[PDB]
């Protein structure tokens, strides 16, 4: 049902094209990136604080000093990526900030979509495509995908409407 | 392309106003 809602918002609202969803996607993938990179960096900059190969027992919660080397981590990411965190508190605030801001931005977009205020179309490219049949982008292909999905899904997805679409009005490409 | 007539001014102002705010704040820092 959630997958239906997701595909419905693609076909009827062009929700992938909405910049508020793009900020949501950036926030969620950045939060996943920050989680993975932060965990890997800490686990690979750990201090040798125990004699076992099992490094997990070289930590106690009541200790005062850091369990991993922020200096080594900073030097590594500065030489690998160009920049690096130098502030632990800023690092963790950023790990908070990125997915929460993504969720808030996607929520603003969903609020827009509630009133059918979509980023459905780029009107310049449709005006050109209506005038010029040689003009094709990936945007116009996505528009055609949305039309096909709407026409083939709406009689089953909205049965209260009694949408009778005869087979000859259904948009379809050659041979399929 | 038949674009919005205000798209250029909106894009330049949307970029340039907070850019100016950030540059003002950075350059005065340490005063």
């Amino acid at each position: 049902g959630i997958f239906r809602f997701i595909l419905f918002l693609q076909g009827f609202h062009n929700w992938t094209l909405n910049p508020f969803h793009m900020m949501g996607v950036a926030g969620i993938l950045g939060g996943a990136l920050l989680c993975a990179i932060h965990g890997a960096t800490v686990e690979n900059t750990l201090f040798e604080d125990g004699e076992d190969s099992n490094t997990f027992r070289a930590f106690e919660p009541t200790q005062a000093e850091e369990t991993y080397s922020m200096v080594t981590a900073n030097r590594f990411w500065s030489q690998i990526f160009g920049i690096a965190f130098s502030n632990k508190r800023w690092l963790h605030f950023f790990m908070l900030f990125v997915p929460v801001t993504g969720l808030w931005m996607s929520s603003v977009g969903i609020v827009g979509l509630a009133l059918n205020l979509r980023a459905y179309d780029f009107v310049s490219q449709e005006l050109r495509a209506a005038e010029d049949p040689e003009f094709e982008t990936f945007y116009t292909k996505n528009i055609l995908l949305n039309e096909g999905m709407r026409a083939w899904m709406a009689p089953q997805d909205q049965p209260h409407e009694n949408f009778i679409f005869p087979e000859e009005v259904l948009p379809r490409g050659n041979a399929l | 392309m038949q674009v919005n007539n205000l798209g250029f001014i909106a894009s330049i102002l949307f970029v340039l106003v907070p850019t100016v705010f950030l540059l003002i704040l950075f350059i005065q820092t340490g005063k």
Binding site: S78, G82, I83 | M1, V15
Partner: peptide
Amino acid sequence: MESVAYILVLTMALAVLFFAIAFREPPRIE
């Protein structure tokens, strides 16, 4: 003419990337 605006904003991001790498505040142990 929108292509100029797109090129400018992409160039601003890439210039910010260069100046943030090349001219970062150096991390100092103190």
